Amino acid sequence: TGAAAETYQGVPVWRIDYKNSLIYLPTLLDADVGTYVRFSDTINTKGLTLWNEHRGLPAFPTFIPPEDEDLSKLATDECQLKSPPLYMYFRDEFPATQLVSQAD
Amino acid sequence: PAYNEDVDRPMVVPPDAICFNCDKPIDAGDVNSYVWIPAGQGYFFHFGCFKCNRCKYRLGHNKFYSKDGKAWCIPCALGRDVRVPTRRWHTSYVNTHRTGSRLTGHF
Amino acid sequence: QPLPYDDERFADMLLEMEVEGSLDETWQDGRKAYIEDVKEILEVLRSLKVRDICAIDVSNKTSNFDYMLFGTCEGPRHIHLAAWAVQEADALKRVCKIRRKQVDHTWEVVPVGRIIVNLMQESLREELSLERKWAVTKCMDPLSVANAPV
Amino acid sequence: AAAAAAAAAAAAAAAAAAAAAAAAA
Amino acid sequence: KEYRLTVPYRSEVTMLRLANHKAINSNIRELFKKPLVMNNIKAIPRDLGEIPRDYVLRLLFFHQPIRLVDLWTICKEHDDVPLDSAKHLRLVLKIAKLQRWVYAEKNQTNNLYYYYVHQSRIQEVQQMVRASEVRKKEQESVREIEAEKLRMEEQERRKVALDENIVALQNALVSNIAQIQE
Amino acid sequence: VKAFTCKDYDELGNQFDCTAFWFPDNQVVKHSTRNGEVGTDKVYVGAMNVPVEFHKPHVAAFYKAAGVPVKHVCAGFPITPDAYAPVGTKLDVRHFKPGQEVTIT
Amino acid sequence: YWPYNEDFVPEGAETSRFQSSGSPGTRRRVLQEYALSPLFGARVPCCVVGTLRTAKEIIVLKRDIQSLLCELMELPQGSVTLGPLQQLREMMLYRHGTPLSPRLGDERQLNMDAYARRPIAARTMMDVFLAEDMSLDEIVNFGRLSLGKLQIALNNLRVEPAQLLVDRMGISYCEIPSLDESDYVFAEVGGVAVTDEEAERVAQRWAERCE
């Protein structure tokens, strides 16, 4: 038991840092540091499509950075893209429908 | 227990410790063959002198009865006629330098 | 110059923290209930002919609610009707309705945000004196935690 | 020596309500 | 095959426990636990003698009614006691009973109390009186020795002051000599 | 590459044990197709630059034949013809989106 | 099983403070002041010089290197300053881009049509700074002049300060690294937006304290 090609399916992305070329996924892998992970784009979920007008469209075929911008002219905090919340409510509590009382 | 702690009382042997029976000094520096009993007061015996001062025999129970400053075995002290021992006569079977007495003491 | 509290050092630390203006800054919150809403609920209950309406503020005291309301009703049907009326009055910000099958035929509680209304019968109200407990309980003293465990 | 043990639930509601702080202190 | 011996850093308590070699000041607990033939731990020598008997008699006279446990506690409280473990005391009481000095007596309580025989207690009373007289004489001699010691201490102070004066003058002379060279 | 691990927090009080993956120099290393069969189009993407002496002779020969800078690792992705990118293209981490769904192998 | 024994701190011993004040508001205000404060140890480098030798050999010639650089940049003697000598790691597996990476002979901007970089040409580095009063344009001009002179000296090598530096001192590299933009643009401290007036007031206060 051990070394084996495992494949987590549909892990949401959480944070992109294109200055340092880092992607943060809100999960923990059972893999050692330095492993060459392969990232692919999930094509559907819950009977829907990942790319669509309701959610958005990708940089098809890939992302081509503009000409004027220069990553060497930007700090690390100016080059981070945080994802919208994955959950809908505070998971310590319950949703307002199931909650006895809510503060708002 | 083992190694009875002697912090309160150092448990040292004075150079001029006199044999309880023959009344002669004990020189602990040369050898430890002598017999010491703290009983904390202090008692000292030569290995030879440990025998009863009256019958000059060993102690069956390893216990003696001091009388007139001299150690007399329980039979002699109680008055029962001394019965000659069989296993050994002139010894005491005690252990030298408190080793047979280190079991009891102050902690 | 000792201090009556069991833990003198911690009690002195807490007193200094409270005086310097740090406990209030840390605990400050603007989500307090509204006496106007309390009065509107009082008027609704009076219109529905509820008896012995009490409004006890619990914001200062350690609790999970502010401005608890207590009322006594003549029967389970009256309790259910009053609860429905309270929920309808809260309809604007209300998120969900109460059960239509009264689980407890002698006690119904409608939570309205920070405010909570408890409608009971006279017997149960006299049995459990929540009003007396919440009126007698002392406010949240920061030094109160400077005592022995229990 | 450091924790105080008390039986508050055995007391009546009135006592446990009007003398909780006094007993705890 | 014990965890303590397996520990990378053997503790001193475990080291002492393992130190069961047949030598002076070796652990007595381990030797006693070992078979009698293997080791040489013989019977504990005790003095069931006249001086211990007199000490026990004095303690009993002080606490006329007393249990064995209470007498042992009093002995423990007393600093310069020639007894230990209370087994020496029990043996002393046994020999005293055999010699008609101290006798036991049963009571309604499950325990029994040791009293002093009437035909032998009178000797203890005079023995205690003589001991008190000797103590008073020793105290008077100690007071005389204290007076002699204070006088000798005054003389010692005088001669020590003389020695200090001469030594200080010698040191001053040495320092003055050492100043000339520099 | 799997860079490190940290903990982040949502706008709400939700804590996520995030794993940060580093994306070194990435380039489309090769294009493949099994005799033009439909659906067999594949793009091979490199992972990280590497010296000449690092790789085995056959791997070095493969990269020399490709003409792309030598890469330590090369993965493959089945795609559609419209998704092709020229060999030697530079891929930025912004190829993905903050909130999308990724398959991690 | 507690991590700390009762004697971890000496009995009846005072402990030094670890934060300004218990008040969160004043703590945040002090944090904002310090964050918006200008850097005090910041020094833009006029030019980073580099040698293929080791620090234990370049320390002896460090002063001579400084004098020769000052002569080369046509400045009054003692006008330039040298930063700490930094020896780059002897990486068995080269990794371009790391600060402690031996600088290569060339760069892509210099030889775009090359299938590899030229071998290592610097194992130790030392920054050269001018007077802080010098403008950014002046610093850039001095760095470019020094770089051009050193490049010409190397080319002709393949008397004057450049030749002396190349031959005697042994330096065989020089660069003008980009500005350290890692600094933080504190537009919000403790969740509170930094108003322009507040930022200007903090800057004025720091300037007054410095003067």
Next chain:
Amino acid sequence: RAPPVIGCTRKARWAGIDDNPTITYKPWDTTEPLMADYGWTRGKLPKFRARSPFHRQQIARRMVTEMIRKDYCIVGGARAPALRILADHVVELAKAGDTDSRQQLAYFLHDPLMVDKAFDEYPRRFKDMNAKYAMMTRLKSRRRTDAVAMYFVEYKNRDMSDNHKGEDYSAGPERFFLPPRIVETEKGIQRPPHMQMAFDRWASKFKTEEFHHWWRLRHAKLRYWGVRNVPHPSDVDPLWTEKEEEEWHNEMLANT
């Protein structure tokens, strides 16, 4: 959220390090110089075979003491890297030179004389050396006993070393109790008087004849136990004789 594999789990001998958040338990302060845990994980020294961790600690102490006594030591198997790292730690203690460091080294080693020798010579010997003070060569000659790789662990900067200068270890001396061979160009060196006296006292024991009787008795013991190539105690000859003593005395006087 929790990781997939929860708790401290043992992995393969050669496995990578993952930064997944788990409660880490260390037996003690592994950062201490001479108190290092032995294990097959990358953060621990290799654990050479022993009957117990206490026995492993005893073996480590013996190896370090022998290294200090004579810089060069030949050790078989996984204990070679452990010995090298322990020697580096001893050098670090010596360079630190603190009284607490000296007391720690005294606790560790078996020989206070060797503790003093290390704390006296290693500071100046490795003042100019940063990190690696011990080298570990691998010998192509494997032990016939159990066919285990042998490693020659040596200290560096022998020239800067004072008591070990000009020593060549290509081949051991004629007798183990004689001073080690000396390079021809370094024949005039003189060792510290205290170390010289200690070595002379140690060698006198073997120079005694009762040692010759013990040697013959060892021949007899091994012959009885089963070791094959043990010549009969009738044929064995003493290691030390008068003519050899005077020749070696002349050699020692010449070497100084």
Next chain:
Amino acid sequence: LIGTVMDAHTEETSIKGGLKVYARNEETNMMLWIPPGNPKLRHEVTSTKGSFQHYLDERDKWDEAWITG
């Protein structure tokens, strides 16, 4: 809640931090680990310094409560 500091994971600001607290209400003794950077768990060390004697006695109180429980 108001509590003491039983332990701190790291000595300098970092996301991989965390701090232990021993809150003690009327009749509740809860020892909790709180991580920094959480927008909802606003934890503030209200004093500029701490007392090791206070830490010791509070730790003793927690130990007694845990044993009794």
Next chain:
Amino acid sequence: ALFSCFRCGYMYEFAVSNSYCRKLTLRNDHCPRCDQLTLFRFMSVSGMVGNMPFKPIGVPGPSYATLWWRKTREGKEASAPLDAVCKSDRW
């Protein structure tokens, strides 16, 4: 551990490591009270060098006799006459 001169009774404390297992029960040392090399007898245990796995340092614990000896030699009453001479914390 505590070691006491055989004759003098002067006691000194020193922890014993694994390297000196066969010198715990008995020792030989230059006692200060008597200016001669004298035998020293073990009396009590202070604490092992190092520490056992996964436990605090002081888990083995000094013996009560060692604690009492240390208290007598460095306590409030003992330190009072000397603390005035020089604050034990500094010079």
Next chain:
Amino acid sequence: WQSGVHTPHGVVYRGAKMKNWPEQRIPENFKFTEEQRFRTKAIPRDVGTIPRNFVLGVLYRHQPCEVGGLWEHCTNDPEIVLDSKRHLREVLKQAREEGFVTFERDAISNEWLCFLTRERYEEVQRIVTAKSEAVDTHSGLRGAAATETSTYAEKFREMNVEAKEAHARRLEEEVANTTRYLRRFQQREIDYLPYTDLNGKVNFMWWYETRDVQ
């Protein structure tokens, strides 16, 4: 130790300096952080034959010795071998453990007075006499002035016959002046080397010399 950090600035001990230890200035603004100050250690000091003999001689001179009085007497004495008050306290502790010095809370004053054990008083007297005789025999210049020696003997006899308290005080003042004058040029250096005994306990071997600063 260093004057500026271990003591407030301006505090200097006129004892015996350590060999090769550099007296380096420290800025007045210097101050430790409390945790570092707690974690700070101290170099072990000599508690052996010479320091204990010196302290016993000082106590023999001034049988009633207060704390400040004892320190001042030690500083005044020209045979100083100690280095600092910490060294003095360590030597006093060693003497107490050996069973030489006894500390008593004086009834007249709260200060802790010091006395010498009567059992050890004979040993102290023997040590003092032996040291005095050794110094007298070693001093080569001493005895060159027979007239001076005779006058000093006459002074000793005069002090013995009369009340010698004033004479002793004047001699103490003269000794202090001479010690200052000596310190102006010479100084007693201490040189130490650590070693490990057979028991495994790290100790220090010390030797004291006299160096002329000039």
Next chain:
Amino acid sequence: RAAARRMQLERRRLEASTHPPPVDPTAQQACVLYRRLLKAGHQQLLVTDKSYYARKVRHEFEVTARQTSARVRGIMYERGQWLVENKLGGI
């Protein structure tokens, strides 16, 4: 540490013994407290029914005090004083 804690507990017990215990108020004090409570309620409260508040306080005074002990009566008297001073705790 245990000895110090026991000593502190003994000191606190001594201080508590020195301090007086709670006492049962007299009829005049009870009437004054009731009048103050009624007047304060009438002046302050606006949501709760004044008649119900008066009835509840009357029932408390005439029932709970009699049912409980003297110490509880004194505690309730002090609590009523606290309520009068702190605005009835919010009503």
Next chain:
Amino acid sequence: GIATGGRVTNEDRRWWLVHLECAPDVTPGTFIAWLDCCGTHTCKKLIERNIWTIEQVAALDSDQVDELKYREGCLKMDVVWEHARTIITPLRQREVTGGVESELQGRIMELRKKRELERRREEILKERANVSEQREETLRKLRE
């Protein structure tokens, strides 16, 4: 700070400036060990060089830094030197004026209110005792 890789950067300098707030009691004369990444070896070598304070460490020069880092064996001496240089000026300003905008008047008022509130608590306890004594006296009167 301690984790700085290769050269020091404005990010590290700003980190040091930010944590200056978290280190209030630090004075320009503070002992050198407070400097980030200053190991035992580094501080021992600085003491040998007679450097005892952050002010002196910052006052050092490039040649001294080089001879400390490459001949004395000190490691990260550049890091500690940069720390001292970046922190000295705020420390000097703090020494000249400890609390700027700290509202010393506000702090004095807070201390006065703390004293007044403690005295008020003691007076409340004494008043409770007096009330208990008055109740006892009233009970005595009723008995009479």
Next chain:
RNA sequence: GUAUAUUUAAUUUUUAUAAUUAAUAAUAAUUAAUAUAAGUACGCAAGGAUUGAUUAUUGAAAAAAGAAAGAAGAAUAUAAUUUA
């Protein structure tokens, strides 16, 4: 129902690269809590369902082409921390 043969599990050690087809782990997991719809459909009335979301149930996996008797670590978590 007391390791041999068959059988099965795994391996045969960096293979730049999963999948044209062979075989092969998950064909309605129900259930429980709360809310929506809705206080609706329906019912004489009291009364009052059907019902895809959230939570609970916590895990998520791809075989076949390259050079081989030391420790896949020059082992103290850096593919050299200066090092003589």
